[PDB]
């Protein structure tokens, strides 16, 4: 009776809170916090006495309307309610722990977002601050919700309807309401990823959001355009970028009529001026989780249309201000060039050097004869800074379609740009603002360096005359470029293995420095200070490097040990987002992919194609069973298949990759030591984690892992999914309970608890150090080193500070940190990455 | 010698946090001033004459001062409410060892101030109602 009566009360009250605002809403929230606490205590007491814990349909239909009300309070204007509502989230986590003690899969199955909910409570334990400061913390948390549910998906759709009605009253009718509107919009932008997947309600939010960007309202218009630009640039969820870039492009493509003639309308100018500010913020900050989404879509055709529109605005105080900001966006766009996707990068970078070199007209302000036209000086500075960044490692390409031959066409093209920079260089002479000319002259000499560095054959002849220039500082720079060219071989010449093989030999020995007690100061220091956005790059470089030196165990022992001991989650923590987890993903995905293909390929061919299995079903659910299906017939077939798959895995111990045995051993040791400092078995957790994170996903979905060419038939798809549960239970050393469907198999799983353990023993019984098995190949791995030398250089300052604090007993006068500065300065700045020849791709 | 001065400091900080005394936000969400009260209460168990005699003079000044304005009056009603609530706990928590050693003080220092509230008061319908309840418990 208690669970039926108590939940019905909760259903009624939780429906009124979301119905509409009330004066006393904040008070009902505090009372509601305590009702939940009492419900937890009774459940704990009842569970101890008898596990039984009834869950009628009303229990689930009221457990959901509660989450639909704890989200919708996160944008309440009152700061008091929002701080309370975050606290209540903790009680949902606790009630899940009591209902199921298996934190491995039960906790993360009843409450899919368990991990992030624990972070909501911690934030609430912070000093109270203003509304703006707090909202920028709520959003960051909302951006981390991953899995759709009924609470996430209905909260977004419920508050959207409220958002769509507030807008009409603000606009259609000609400050308190305006602050509520600003909160709702930030809510939908940050928590829109869940509701993603034509006419879906998410794609209608975007449409309405690109009409307010050009809102011309007499009274409030200004504030709407300003907040929309701020929210859509800084707070949007990364999972929505592809839907944005693809919607801004289709809005700008209508400003050009047939034959490509622009159409100035005084509102297209306002739209094309917000887009630049949105794209400048959205690109100029690094947000976690955007790596896989930023590079999914191309923005080439949108950027070309932006320069080709502003090109026609003309000369004025306003037009010259738009041109300056467009040049600053291009400079940021070239800083993120390794996270974007290009269909033709060489022609794109060539076709914008052509456009932006037409605004670099010099002496315009003197000819302008106006004092307000000092801006045109700033435009030259902006355009040259952009052009320098576009020419770094850029081969010149003449736009084809003309009779002139390729070699002769490139030479005429180099001369065009060279003579342009020389003319600009002469006008910056001191005789012909002592700071403005100093900067602009520095850039022009740094753009001829890049043009020549990449086109030595095409344009060395036109440049030899720079050695007798009238400016002694220009002759010095030109004679340092000629020095670099001479030291680089004209072609490969098989000189990489000789000329450069020993150049970086000292670099790798520095990072692999076996710091006393095996601490690896450089590697560990590098981990902390690198930005999170670059954690994918760091995992690949570190793992590849150390393994090539036969020290992979050393890196891992220092990497997993910290998190396992730091957090009681131990193995569980390696499945979130953190550097220690990304090293795990890399090892499985690169070293284990071939292990699975040679294992599951022959077996899946049998069941999928063999005649014996032409007409079979693996449906053992009586409720779902069809009238013609026979339960006895279905059960026997499913059991036989599990014998084939399970048997094959056990016999494949010898072929287990060497790279993965070290990973398994570290967990065995790290977990074993974890118990030491605190009847649990070490091998129990290693095997369970290995099965759930490595093998099970491959079996369940072999097509989406590349083991198969086409999706399996639905019949076989069901069979594989059920077999996974049986295989998982054997590893966990558990039997079937509460699921009468699978109970008949509890005899088969029990008989296999022994054989499974022996298998886990073989892989995890390798020595902590590979003394028995040793070899020395010592791969040069030239292409990997250049990535390392590029990563160290960009983080020189931060890496130095971190190392200085530690190693106190022995000063840093000759500690690794002092060796790094000497070696980095000796090697010099890293080269420029070459243009990309494919679309963006990841691991 | 020295510690005597320490007691005065705790007593003195009690005065400068009464609402009628200018509120300088030293309350710090009232947690800081809340701690000062409880520490003052505990000291009474060992220095009964000093703490009590300190509180009569604090109360004697608050009563005998002039204020104008509706906002100012609400403070005076609120400040005196705190003094009596605190003054009663000092008496209530004293060990019951028949510590009847205050003959001089009461006759001319404390009583002529408590009797002031108990007079039938027509200044306020509600304000005087709660004070007379508070002053009766002390007497």
């Amino acid at each position: 009776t208690f669970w039926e009566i108590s939940s019905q009360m909760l259903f009624y009250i939780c429906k009124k809170l979301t119905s509409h605002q009330m004066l006393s809403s904040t008070e009902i929230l505090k009372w509601l916090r305590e009702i939940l606490i009492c419900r937890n205590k009774f459940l704990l007491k009842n569970k101890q006495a008898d596990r039984s814990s009834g869950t009628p349909p009303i229990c689930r239909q009221a457990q959901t309307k509660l989450e639909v009300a704890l989200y919708m309070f996160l944008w309440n204007p009152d700061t008091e309610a929002v701080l309370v509502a975050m606290s209540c989230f903790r009680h949902l986590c606790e009630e899940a722990d009591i209902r199921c003690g298996v934190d491995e899969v039960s906790v993360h199955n009843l409450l899919p977002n368990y991990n992030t909910f624990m972070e909501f409570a911690s934030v609430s334990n912070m000093m109270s601050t203003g509304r703006a400061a707090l909202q920028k913390r709520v959003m960051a948390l909302l951006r981390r919700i991953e899995h759709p549910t009924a609470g996430n998906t209905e909260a977004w759709e419920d508050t959207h309807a409220k958002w769509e009605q507030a807008t009409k009253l603000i606009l259609n009718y000609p400050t308190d309401s305006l602050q509520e509107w600003i909160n709702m919009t930030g809510f939908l932008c940050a928590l829109g990823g869940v509701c993603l997947q034509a006419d879906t309600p998410v794609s209608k939010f975007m449409d309405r959001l690109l009409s307010l960007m050009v809102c011309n309202h007499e009274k409030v218009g200004l504030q709407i355009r300003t907040n929309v630009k701020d929210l859509v640039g800084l707070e949007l969820s990364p999972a929505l970028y592809p839907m944005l870039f693809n919607k801004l492009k289709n809005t700008i493509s209508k400003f050009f009529d047939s034959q490509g003639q622009v159409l100035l309308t005084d509102t297209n100018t306002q739209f094309v001026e917000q887009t630049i500010a949105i794209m400048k913020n959205l690109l100029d900050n690094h947000t976690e989780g955007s790596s896989e989404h930023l590079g999914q879509a191309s923005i080439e055709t949108m950027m070309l249309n932006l320069v080709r529109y502003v090109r026609v605005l003309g000369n004025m105080v306003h037009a010259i201000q738009i041109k300056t900001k467009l040049c600053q966006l291009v400079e940021v766009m070239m800083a993120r060039r390794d996270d974007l996707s290009f269909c033709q990068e060489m022609k794109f970078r060539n076709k914008m050097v052509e456009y932006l070199t037409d605004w670099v007209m010099g002496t315009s302000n003197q000819a302008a004869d106006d004092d307000v036209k000092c801006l045109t000086r700033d435009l030259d500075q902006a355009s040259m800074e952009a052009v320098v960044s576009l020419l770094a490692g850029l081969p010149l390409q003449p736009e084809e379609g003309d009779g002139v031959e390729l070699m002769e066409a490139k030479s005429q093209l180099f001369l065009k740009y060279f003579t342009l920079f020389m003319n600009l260089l002469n006008d910056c002479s001191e005789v012909e603002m002592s700071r403005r000319l100093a900067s602009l002259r520095h850039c022009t000499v740094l753009a001829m360096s890049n043009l020549l560095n990449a086109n030595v054959d095409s344009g060395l002849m036109h440049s030899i005359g720079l050695g007798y220039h009238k400016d002694l500082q220009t002759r010095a720079t030109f004679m340092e470029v000629l020095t670099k060219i001479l030291q680089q071989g004209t072609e490969f010449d098989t000189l990489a293995e000789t000329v450069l093989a020993d150049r970086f030999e000292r670099l790798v020995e520095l990072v692999t420095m076996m710091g006393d007690q095996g601490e690896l100061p450089i590697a560990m220091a590098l981990a902390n200070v690198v930005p999170c956005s670059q954690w994918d790059e760091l995992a690949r470089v570190l793992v590849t490097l150390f393994d090539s030196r036969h020290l992979l165990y050393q890196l891992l022992w220092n990497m997993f040990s910290k998190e396992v001991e730091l957090a009681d989650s131990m193995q569980t923590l390696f499945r979130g987002n953190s550097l220690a987890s990304k090293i795990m993903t890399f090892c499985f995905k690169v070293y284990g992919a071939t292990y699975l293909q040679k294992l599951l390929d022959p077996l899946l061919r049998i069941v999928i194609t063999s005649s014996d299995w032409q007409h079979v079903s693996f449906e053992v659910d009586p409720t779902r069973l069809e009238p013609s299906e026979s339960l006895e017939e279905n059960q026997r077939n499913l059991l036989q298949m599990t014998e084939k798959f399970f048997h094959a895995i056990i016999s494949s111990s010898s072929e287990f990759p060497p790279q993965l045995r070290s990973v398994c051993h570290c967990l065995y040791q790290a977990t074993c030591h974890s118990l030491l400092n605190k009847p649990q078995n070490s091998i129990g957790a290693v095997g369970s984690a290995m099965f759930l994170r490595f093998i099970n996903p491959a079996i369940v979905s072999p097509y989406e892992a590349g083991i198969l060419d086409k999706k399996p038939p639905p019949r076989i798809e069901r069979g594989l999914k059920l077999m996974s549960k049986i295989l998982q239970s054997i590893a966990n050393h558990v039997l079937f309970t509460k699921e009468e469907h699978m109970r008949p198999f509890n005899d088969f799983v029990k008989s296999n608890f022994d054989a499974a353990r022996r298998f886990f023993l073989d892989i995890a019984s390798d020595c902590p150090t590979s003394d028995a098995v040793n070899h020395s190949l010592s791969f040069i791995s030239d292409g990997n080193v250049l990535a390392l030398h590029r990563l160290l250089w960009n983080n020189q300052e931060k890496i130095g500070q971190y190392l200085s604090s530690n190693r106190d007993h022995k000063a840093v006068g000759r500690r690794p940190f002092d060796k790094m500065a000497t070696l980095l300065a000796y090697l010099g700045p890293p080269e420029h990455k070459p243009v990309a020849d494919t679309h963006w791709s990841s691991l | 010698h020295r510690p005597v001065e320490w007691v005065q400091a705790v007593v003195s900080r009690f005065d400068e946090q009464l609402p009628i005394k200018t509120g300088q936000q030293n309350t710090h969400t009232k947690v800081s001033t809340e701690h000062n009260k409880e520490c003052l209460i505990n000291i009474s168990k060992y220095k009964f004459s000093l703490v009590i005699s300190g509180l009569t003079t604090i109360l004697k000044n608050v009563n005998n001062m002039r204020i104008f304005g509706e906002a100012a009056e609400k403070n005076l009603y609120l400040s005196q409410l705190i003094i009596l609530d605190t003054l009663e706990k000092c008496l209530a928590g004293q060990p019951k060892d028949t510590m009847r050693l205050d003959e001089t003080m009461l006759v001319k220092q404390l009583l002529p101030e408590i009797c002031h509230f108990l007079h039938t008061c027509r200044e306020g319908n509600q304000h005087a109602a709660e004070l007379r309840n508070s002053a009766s418990g002390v007497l």
């Binding site: - | 510690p3 320490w6 007691v7 701690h35 000291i43």
Partner: protein, 473 residues
């Protein structure tokens, strides 16, 4: 650059890699700072001038940075490293002997402008030292003090005291293994920490951190304690020492361990963060040697080790956990072992001195919790500490608004009144009864006005007697 590309010399390929790497270090902004030309983009541009044949340059910016003898060591040791690498490939090379002779000729002669620098160089490139030389270095230190107090030209000779102490740091490890001076040089480090100057205090510790380190490699503390080793060698000249204790106010015959910690407490006030960490290491090192003599796990609380554990309280996480307050393994302030009234009065004075000068929220929190706890555990002797707590508490009661820092303070007030009404058994002048009346003064901040305390006349006589006793001739 000339050594690398010289033909008359045949350096192996290993050596040439060393010279090329040194050639790059000297161009870093670290070395530009040692040579005194920071704020300069390129040194070559400033060295030359294009119009040297036309006009004469006019010097400007007469302000010139001060040169520190610690910078000369870094330069003098990077150059010594270069020379040695070359001497390996040159048989019967005489480069280092010739450089050594030039250094001597200037170190041991009176010159205000060259002797300080030559002394530092001499102690860095020397491979041997005899008793006679170690005698002359101390005699220079003796005279530098004498001249310093006589006249106002103090800074001139305060540098000659710094270079002498720096040299003794570099030369002691080369002394004879059985010389008596390995121990007598401990009383020179202490006598240099009593002069109250940041530069003399910084150089004094470096001679003490290594003096302990050297004595271990000779295994002198294997079967003894620091109090016995250093106090035995002080016995012959106790008459002069007995007067230095009286003025400084820290008796070494009463409680050696608390007297020594009375000198190392001022190191928390040093402006340089790198010297505060050095004094923390010395405290760890002295704790290990005293317990090992007792075989007491290096963290046990006893009469010998209580002093060092009080000082490390606010810096070391391990000490707090291993010695935690009872009313939350063992616990500090144990009344079963800390029974003597004296030893429980020198522990509270240390705890009150640290708070008086500390100005960190976190540090004050931890210390006031132990003082509050100590009020109930040592009611009799607590009132010998009121003055060190009087002023700062008075302000804290009024203006503080931190609940974390306010609860422990209120505990102290509640405990003084409760235990009052008893006649004062121990007064505030109890410590002066047996010497330690200067513990709370010596640990104060360094004085801006760099003036010799004027009892240095006693130190000069003390050193003079030291030479005669152990270096008769």
């Amino acid at each position: 650059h000339s050594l690398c590309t010289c033909s008359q010399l045949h350096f192996s390929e290993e050596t040439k890699q060393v010279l090329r790497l040194s050639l790059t270090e000297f161009s870093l902004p670290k070395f530009y700072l040692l040579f005194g030309i920071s704020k300069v983009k390129s040194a070559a541009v400033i060295a030359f001038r294009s119009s040297y044949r036309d006009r004469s340059f006019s010097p400007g910016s007469y302000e010139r940075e001060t040169f520190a003898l610690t910078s000369l060591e870094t330069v003098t040791e990077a150059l010594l490293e270069i020379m040695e690498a070359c001497m390996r490939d040159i048989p019967t090379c005489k480069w280092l002997d010739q450089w050594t002779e030039l250094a001597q000729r200037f170190a041991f002669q009176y010159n205000p402008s060259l002797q300080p620098r030559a002394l530092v160089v001499f102690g860095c490139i020397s491979k041997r030292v005899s008793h006679g030389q170690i005698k002359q270095i101390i005699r220079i230190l003796s005279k530098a003090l004498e001249s310093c107090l006589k006249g106002p030209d103090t800074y001139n000779s305060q540098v000659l005291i710094e270079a002498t102490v720096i040299a003794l740091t570099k030369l002691q490890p080369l002394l004879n293994k059985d010389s008596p001076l390995h121990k007598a040089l401990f009383w020179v480090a202490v006598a240099v920490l009593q002069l109250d100057e940041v530069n003399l205090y910084s150089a004094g510790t470096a001679l003490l951190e290594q003096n302990l380190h050297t004595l271990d490699s000779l295994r002198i503390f294997n079967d003894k304690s620091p109090e016995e080793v250093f106090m035995a060698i002080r016995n012959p000249l106790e008459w002069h020492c007995k007067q230095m204790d009286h003025f400084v106010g820290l008796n070494f015959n009463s409680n050696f361990n608390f007297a020594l910690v009375g000198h190392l407490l001022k190191g928390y006030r040093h402006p340089s963060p790198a010297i505060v960490a050095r004094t923390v290491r010395i405290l760890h090192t002295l704790l290990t040697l005293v317990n090992k003599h007792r075989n007491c796990d290096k963290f046990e609380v006893n009469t010998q080790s209580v002093a060092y554990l009080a000082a490390l309280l606010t810096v070391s996480e391990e000490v707090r956990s291993r010695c935690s307050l009872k009313h939350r393994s063992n616990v500090l302030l144990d009344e079963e072992v800390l029974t003597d009234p004296k030893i429980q009065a020198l522990l509270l004075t240390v705890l009150a001195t640290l708070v008086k000068y500390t100005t960190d929220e976190f540090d004050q929190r931890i210390l006031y919790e132990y003082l509050a706890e100590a009020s109930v555990v040592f009611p009799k002797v607590f009132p010998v500490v009121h003055n060190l707590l009087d002023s700062k508490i008075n302000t804290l009661l009024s203006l503080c608004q931190d609940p974390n820092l306010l609860n422990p303070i209120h505990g102290i007030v509640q405990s003084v009144v409760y235990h009052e009404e008893s006649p004062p058994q121990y007064q505030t002048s109890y410590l002066q009864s047996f010497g330690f009346n200067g513990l709370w003064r010596f640990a104060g901040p360094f004085s801006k006005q760099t003036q010799i305390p004027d009892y240095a006349e006693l130190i000069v006589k003390f050193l003079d007697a030291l030479i005669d006793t152990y270096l008769p001739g």
